[PDB]
């Protein structure tokens with residue numbers, strides 16, 4: 001049965017939400033959509049309510065809306081943000097124009113932790129363990145996050161962590177230009193479009209985050225793409241012929257080869273005083289050749305996580321059908337697919 005909806009002005013736009021959601025207060029707004037904090041009186045949870053902005057204004061927009069809803073509906077894991085609710089005030093497909101997504105209200109992120117606490121090695125172990133636990137789940141569904149960084153990691157007062165805001169394909173070229181955290185955690189093969197990338201790109205980001213938790217400093221704070229590449233190759237060494245072969249862009253290959261060769265540095269002398277097991281794990285995630293990087297499942301079994309690792313409590317995901325990504329549809333067809341997914345949604349148990 002349809003709940004009763006009520007209306008409110010809020011940001012600059014009209015919000016129409018079921019009565020269960022009370023005390024809406026705006027917290028953020030962008031080109032993707034406006035967000036309000038609220039109290040869900042039916043569950044007792046503080047929630048984030050996101051109203052999508054122009055969900056169906058083009059084919060690209062309509063597909064992205066469908067992609068986001070499919071992803072959030074699938075994610076059911078302690079270390080990944082899931083979907084609490086999705087609703088529309090429309091009573092039929094013909095009047096369907098607005099989409100609202102409801103998720104747990106997340107407070108602090110990994111940024112609000114790195115520059116305040118010195119973080120003990122035990123805290124680093126637990127935080128990275130949870131990222132990898134969530135990543136094992138995400139990767140088992142052939143989902144790549146693509147945009148892992150500290151601002152996409154929520155951490156509550158108990159150092160419990162959740163992965164947020166997947167890389168649904170946006171970050172304009174201008175947002176990735178210059179001295180910006182939007183680029184500091186990206187694998188070089190994605191940064192420079194070397195090749196068709198795999199889910200190992202996320203492991204590179206985890207290595208950058210780990211390092212920053214250990215030192216309190218950005219690992220590769222490049223002032224631009226090329227400066228950042230130089231910082232990376234100084235640490236891990238310039239590529240050998242075997243990795244060069246795998247770079248498809250003849251122009252990217254030629255450029256790499258213009259650089260003076262450099263050996264891999266001693267990580268024990270970079271991460272001074274760190275746990276030798278942390279150094280070993282960093283050496284295995286920050287490998288230039290993504291074919292040779294450690295996977296999430298392999299990293300969970302590394303001795304660095306011995307006090308948390310439990311092979312019977314690191315679950316994998318149900319199969320996730322992404323055939324729609326190869327599909328070409330019209331706006332109204334993406335819209336009807338999205339509507340179907342709204343009306344079939346079943347809430348999680350509390």
Ligand SMILES: NC1=Nc2nc3cc4c(cc3n2[C@H](c2ccc(OCc3cn5ccccc5n3)cc2)N1)OCCCO4
Pocket residue numbers: 060167168169170171190191192193
């Ligand atoms: N206009 C437009 N629409 C899209 N919809 C998408 C949907 C996808 C997807 C990509 C999608 N794009 C692309 C798009 C997405 C991300 C981008 O950043 C990384 C990037 C690409 N560079 C190309 C040259 C130089 C630098 C450089 N840096 C650049 C373009 N462009 O890949 C998987 C995520 C979900 O599926």
